Amino acid sequence: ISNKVDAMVDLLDLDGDSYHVNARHLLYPNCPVTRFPVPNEKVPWETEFLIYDPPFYTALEPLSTIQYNVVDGLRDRRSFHGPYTVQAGLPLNPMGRTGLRGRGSLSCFGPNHTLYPMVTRWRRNEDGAICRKSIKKMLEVLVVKLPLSEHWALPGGSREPGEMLPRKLKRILRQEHWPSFENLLKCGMEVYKGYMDDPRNTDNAWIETVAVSVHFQDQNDVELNRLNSNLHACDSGASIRWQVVDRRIPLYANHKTLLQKAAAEFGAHY
Amino acid sequence: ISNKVDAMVDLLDLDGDSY
């Protein structure tokens, strides 16, 4: 009775925003600099902020003769979501403000284009038959780990003009093997042609991706029998490894955004 | 008291066609 009346002593005592969340961060990667804090309220380029005094780090003003909003030389300076504006001779970062100016550790001002590719297989278990995940089906991706890093970054990056293969799945990876998957990349669905949330962005420069995906339905096909056992996978790097695509991949968060919309095209579990 | 307080443990748990 003591225990229950102790349950009656207490019984009568009963009466966000979706903006770029990676560029607007302190400590611009690999540089002892800071960004002027830009809260979510004043991120757009029309909100009036007059205390604005951001730094100008770039790893001035005669930058004319730059064909913005068009294909400036062999660079294609026009972003996917329409033309941008120019505040003298430097472009203005769309999608909001960052807190820094200049270019940072980037090639050139404007839309920097990379071509992060997606290569997938349903993970084999013991028989070939895909083993059911928690609810829906489960896939894998091929990720690469260069030594001086802490995440299993996707195998792709800066597209050298006329390469069509993103300079990293072209080097320190499969080599003397290009013609085949360079004849396969013109076959597949696009999942994201747009802007990334890199921590390396600035108010006068940004990076963009085209994201192609290729899937291998079988396990002993003529594609998985010539992709895996034809790759050098080590020129000066330190790793290559197929990884299970879960909610907490040790991948770069920006790339995990891509997977969160790419694995969803088949009914997977990210 | 055990029997009644067992009646008070649950006592405060109260809050066609025609063809």
Add this chain to the structure above:
Amino acid sequence: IKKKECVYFVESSKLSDAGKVVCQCGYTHEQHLEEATKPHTFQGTQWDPKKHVQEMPTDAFGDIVFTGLSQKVKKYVRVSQDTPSSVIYHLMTQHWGLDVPNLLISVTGGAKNFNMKPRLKSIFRRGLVKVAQTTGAWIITGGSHTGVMKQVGEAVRDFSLSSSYKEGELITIGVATWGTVHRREGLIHPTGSFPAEYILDEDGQGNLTCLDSNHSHFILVDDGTHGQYGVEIPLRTRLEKFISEQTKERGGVAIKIPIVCVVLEGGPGTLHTIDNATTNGTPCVVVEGSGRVADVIAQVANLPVSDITISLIQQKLSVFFQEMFETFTESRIVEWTKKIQDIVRRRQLLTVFREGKDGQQDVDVAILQALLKASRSQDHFGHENWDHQLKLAVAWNRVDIARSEIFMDEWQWKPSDLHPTMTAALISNKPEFVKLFLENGVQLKEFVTWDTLLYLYENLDPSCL
């Protein structure tokens, strides 16, 4: 003598200023501003804090003893702001005589303004001595005889003059800024100090804070400035990571050292204290109802990140912050809002210590409340991370919590994975956790293999005859 590795980071500050502070002139310091190279030649036209902060080896590495307040030995080092957290982990481990920690309670807060409530003053030490009682916890706090740092050193004395183990084994690391120490003279001897002296006078400090008197080891950082607090903030945030994430090596790959950050009240340097920690990945708990910056992030910690604006921070900085409010300009409230928003959308690294009819217990259940919401997002990419979750969850015997957090998930019932947790619940008593495993139906008959009895039999109670 490991002095050929650590450095001054002392500054060749050419005299190019006059601020008229404490009846003096010039830039921070005096005729001791010219160490050996002097303000000479042409080095210096505008005092860039990056061009020339030349790094010479230390001169403050010894053992400090107070006058009569504590007849003991305490070892201190004058480290720089750029020394890696591996010249020093190789130095506390084996150059000092310290073990490998298992828990890293970080107790930060306010300074030189602190009136701990007579009842909160009681929940604090009943909450902070018990974590020290068990495991091998390290207490890393700022080194000063003021603030929550004077209350965390005010309970270790109670737990060293009357305790279970008597004597004392707590390892209360004190890390502060060298420049913000009152009588730095006598603490600077070439080679070592070897029982040097530190007189505790708190009347002539003016603005230069004295050290505490109940910590264990003092790690003084240096940047070459006088009166600039806040220098000791970034370095400990890699200290508390490299110690707590890449120092242990069973499991063949890696295991995370538990780390928690407790904050009571606060100030300008307390928000940069928790933002850097949460960004790094240190779970933190805020004690609501205390006062300053703890509270202003105690009642905004559940609202949407979009709701938090300059207007809300203006209204919520005019109640907890009374006399400092008029000091707050329009360039310190739009720089205080972005950091608050930043620590808010890390909702998986921040909790709150509810006061009245909620969280009616010591600070301790709150530290694993922070860990629980933190590691719920971290429950599968760590794999073994469940095992240490329970190795702390035995500290409160959170039978109801362990039932609530796992047994009503979409739990794969994982009979094999329940066995490392079974053994973790066997190494000491845990009377109810093992029964928890038997309604789950841990089949003992295959759980006990030959190596299982091995593991059980090396872990007898050491106190038994």
